[PDB]
């Protein structure tokens, strides 16, 4: 949602695995959704309907 993704937040292992390609981009999207910072940005301050 146009939040700046700060550089230290990213998982190097997940992007490296996507670089190898054992996962599709969809799998990397899933893993990125499982990231704690994703919940911190959206699940954490906002109502469940929002």
């Amino acid at each position: 949602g146009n939040t700046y993704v700060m550089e230290s937040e990213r998982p190097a292992t997940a992007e490296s695995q996507l670089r190898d390609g054992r996962i599709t981009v969809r799998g990397f999207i899933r893993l990125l959704a499982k990231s704690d910072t994703y919940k911190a940005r959206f699940f954490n301050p906002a109502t469940q309907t929002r």
């Binding site: 054992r22 599709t24 799998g27």
Partner: protein, 69 residues
């Protein structure tokens, strides 16, 4: 997922059988045509939905191997 059941990921080798190609052609090529044979890594948790969705897509499994045990 963290559970002993959740682990033991199972590799899945998928072939685009003629049924899958016929389904994809008539649904429309909104995605690029990819080669028929392709292996996919699927854990135990989402093991069932993978070949479920492939079956509704008309494809059939080549073989399945277990990553862990």
């Amino acid at each position: 997922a963290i559970t002993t059941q959740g682990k033991r990921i199972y590799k899945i080798t998928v072939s685009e059988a003629g049924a899958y190609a016929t389904n994809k052609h008539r649904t429309g090529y909104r995605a690029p045509i990819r080669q028929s044979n392709y292996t996919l890594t699927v854990p135990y948790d989402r093991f069932l939905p993978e070949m479920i969705r492939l079956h509704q897509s008309g494809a059939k499994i080549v073989n399945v191997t277990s990553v862990i045990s």
